[PDB]
């Protein structure tokens, strides 16, 4: 799949919806980004950064009307340059739950409440995208 890749989510997101992304981090990778979009707004921005002040950190945020909000940062960094990964985003009623390589990583409380209007997922960054899909559990 060509990155940046756009995965349309017909009818928006809904609890019990599971998105699975498989890929390989490029060697010398700098960043990865998943953008759950509601029109121009970004409902949930998941952004692993490989070198932020020589620190590997995951930044999560929401962008409303061209403005980024309060960042939520995670130190647990499970991605590795040059290695295959699997990211699963499970949509729950109150949060997006993220697990990487089968290990729960983080939860992101819904700032954008109209879930049915979050109808696109943008995937970009320094990765080789192998697969991107969704299902209902
Ligand atoms: C430490 C700190 O506050 N750093 C922020 C940067 O993280 C921020 O970068 C933007 O962050 C958003 C997510 O919040 C998104 O990843 C953008 O791509 C990225 O540019 C920057 C701009 O808001 O400000 C710094 O101070």
Curated annotation (Swiss-Prot):
Subcellular localization: Cytoplasm; Nucleus; Secreted
Tissue and organ expression note: A major expression is found in the colonic epithelium. It is also abundant in the activated macrophages. Expressed in fetal membranes.
Residues that, per the record, bind a beta-D-galactoside: 68-74
UniProt entry keywords in alphabetical sequence: Acetylation, Cytoplasm, Differentiation, Disulfide bond, IgE-binding protein, Immunity, Innate immunity, Lectin, mRNA processing, mRNA splicing, Nucleus, Phosphoprotein, Repeat, Secreted, Spliceosome
GO cellular component, one term: secretory granule membrane
Domain annotation Galectin: ranges: 5-135
UniProt record, GO biological process: eosinophil chemotaxis; epithelial cell differentiation; innate immune response; macrophage chemotaxis; monocyte chemotaxis; mononuclear cell migration; mRNA processing; negative regulation of endocytosis
Modified residues (Phosphoserine): 75
Record GO terms (molecular function): carbohydrate binding; chemoattractant activity; disaccharide binding; IgE binding; laminin binding; molecular condensate scaffold activity; protein phosphatase binding; protein phosphatase inhibitor activity
Organism domain of life: Eukaryota
Chain ranges for the short sequence motif Nuclear export signal as given in the UniProt record: 113-128
UniProt key word Translocase: no
Quaternary structure note: Probably forms homo- or heterodimers. Interacts with DMBT1. Interacts with CD6 and ALCAM. Forms a complex with the ITGA3, ITGB1 and CSPG4. Interacts with LGALS3BP, LYPD3, ZFTRAF1 and UACA. Interacts with TRIM16; this interaction mediates autophagy of damage endomembranes. Interacts with cargo receptor TMED10; the interaction mediates the translocation from the cytoplasm into the ERGIC (endoplasmic reticulum-Golgi intermediate compartment) and thereby secretion.
Protein function: Galactose-specific lectin which binds IgE. May mediate with the alpha-3, beta-1 integrin the stimulation by CSPG4 of endothelial cells migration. Together with DMBT1, required for terminal differentiation of columnar epithelial cells during early embryogenesis. In the nucleus: acts as a pre-mRNA splicing factor. Involved in acute inflammatory responses including neutrophil activation and adhesion, chemoattraction of monocytes macrophages, opsonization of apoptotic neutrophils, and activation of mast cells.
Protein name according to UniProt: Galectin-3
Gene coding for it: LGALS3
Covered range of the whole protein: 114 to 250 of 250
């Amino acid at each position: 799949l060509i990155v940046p890749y756009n995965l349309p989510l017909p009818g928006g997101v809904v609890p019990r919806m599971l998105i699975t992304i498989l890929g390989t981090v490029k060697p010398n990778a700098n960043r990865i980004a998943l953008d759950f979009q509601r029109g121009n707004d970004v409902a949930f921005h998941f952004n692993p950064r490989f070198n932020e002040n020589n620190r590997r950190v995951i930044v999560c945020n929401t962008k409303l009307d061209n403005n980024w909000g309060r960042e939520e940062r995670q130190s647990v960094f499970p991605f590795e340059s040059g290695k295959p990964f699997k990211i699963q985003v499970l949509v729950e009623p109150d949060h997006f739950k993220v697990a990487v390589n089968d290990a729960h990583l983080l939860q992101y409380n819904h700032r954008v409440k109209k879930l049915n209007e979050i109808s696109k997922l943008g995937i970009s960054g320094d990765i080789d995208l192998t697969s991107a899909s969704y299902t209902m559990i």
